[PDB]
Subunit: 147 residues, 3 copies
Amino acid sequence: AMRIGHGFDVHAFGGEGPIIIGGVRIPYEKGLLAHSDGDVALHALTDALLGAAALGDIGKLADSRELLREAWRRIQAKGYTLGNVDVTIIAQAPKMLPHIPQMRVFIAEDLGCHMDEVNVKATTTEKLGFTGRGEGIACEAVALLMK
Amino acid sequence: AMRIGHGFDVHAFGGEGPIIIGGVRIPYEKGLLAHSDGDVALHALTDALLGAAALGDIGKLFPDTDPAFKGADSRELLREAWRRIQAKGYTLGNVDVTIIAQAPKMLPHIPQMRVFIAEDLGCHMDEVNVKATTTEKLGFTGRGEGIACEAVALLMK
Amino acid sequence: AMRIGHGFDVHAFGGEGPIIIGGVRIPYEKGLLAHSDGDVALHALTDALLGAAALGDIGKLFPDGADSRELLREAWRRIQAKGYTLGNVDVTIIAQAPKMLPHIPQMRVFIAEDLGCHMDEVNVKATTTEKLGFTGRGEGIACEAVALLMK
Ligand SMILES: Nc1ccn([C@@H]2O[C@H](CO)[C@@H](O)[C@H]2O)c(=O)n1
Ligand SMILES: Nc1ccn([C@@H]2O[C@H](CO)[C@@H](O)[C@H]2O)c(=O)n1
Ligand SMILES: Nc1ccn([C@@H]2O[C@H](CO)[C@@H](O)[C@H]2O)c(=O)n1
Ligand SMILES: [Mg+2]
Ligand SMILES: [Mg+2]
Ligand SMILES: [Mg+2]
Ligand SMILES: [Zn+2]
Ligand SMILES: [Zn+2]
Ligand SMILES: [Zn+2]
């Protein structure tokens, strides 16, 4: 059995930087307003993982990495193993690209998997919408689980 | 043989509520402007499902410039859609649905949604995940201009 | 083992039409401002495919009038080299306009061609955002794609 999952998250820029994406501390003029550390990549990912497992979402269960590992724990308890993941960061800024490998390292660790089972990307919305206006950051993620 | 699908839908708020999301009647100050009942979740879901099956989309099967589908039950679209997917030899792996809305509160309605979705697809509920999020007052959903929904689906032969 | 991938792209309207989507020349009053030919459907799709293969994204490969089909083909060649084969793809075009629907069959033809697959393994769809957001106000076109690879 395979299971597909999908995740989406957003946060608004606010306060002083830096910001935290895919566990990576990323220098930026601006900070992320959130009830948590505001790691949209890790959130989207977690929700994807959980959704695949039909465990709902996060609010159904700070440090985004800890949340991620917790979620993963519960997910594994249901009898699931990791197939692969793919993550898509949506931001006008800052530049994500240099940070992608380290992100991957961290996620790989947190999920107990190999790096080759983790993909992270970035794109801009070319100055369009709320991302485009630099109002915030978004991230989508998808996930494949094996039973 | 397995098959991956993806869907996405949006409606504008307008008129009086309530709204219909995942087949569930949800009280709200505002309604959903649509040709149909505006069930944005079932729509996204339907499109992810037809998408995996290479049958195209909702709109192909059920146009917007057709009087028959005025105020149409999105659950009916869904069942039909599904019928057609089965006829093509497919069976349901799983679905994951993500509702994107500042308001109203989706949380309490999610179980009933799943029941509806499960029944319509002839699956077990554990094959169906529905979640909800907001955009933290960002963009068009954030400003409460409307509701969006994504869905992913996995089919099996 | 199965692999899945997810892709997303966006371009802004600008200059004179037409636009190119899923490799199809589509008439329209406006053009697409892009470093490339601005084919969001193929960029999104390429990213989806690259993602599944854990090859990153378009940018890591081809850092930004490029024929987006050429990119797609090259990407696919690298994916193929890495042991992979095509399961299926599914594309979601997000646009107030122009009308995508009649061009969809030809898109699928192109993509199938480019990927070396049968076209039943390629789905393309289109949706509006009902005048909402940047797509809705006719500021741009967006595309999302998912892909499923086999090893
Ligand atoms: N820009 C767009 C948006 C939508 N469509 C077609 O209209 C139907 C309803 O969204 C959809 O089924 C889709 O086929 C289109 O052709 N072009
Ligand atoms: N429109 C919405 C948006 C969010 N939610 C719930 O609030 C939590 C925050 O994302 C989510 O976990 C979700 O449970 C909701 O019930 N309705
Ligand atoms: N906020 C962002 C957005 C995009 N990017 C990178 O720039 C290239 C444009 O697609 C992409 O290859 C993407 O990796 C980035 O580094 N940071
Ligand atoms: Mg949130
Ligand atoms: Mg629609
Ligand atoms: Mg891009
Ligand atoms: Zn969040
Ligand atoms: Zn709709
Ligand atoms: Zn692009």
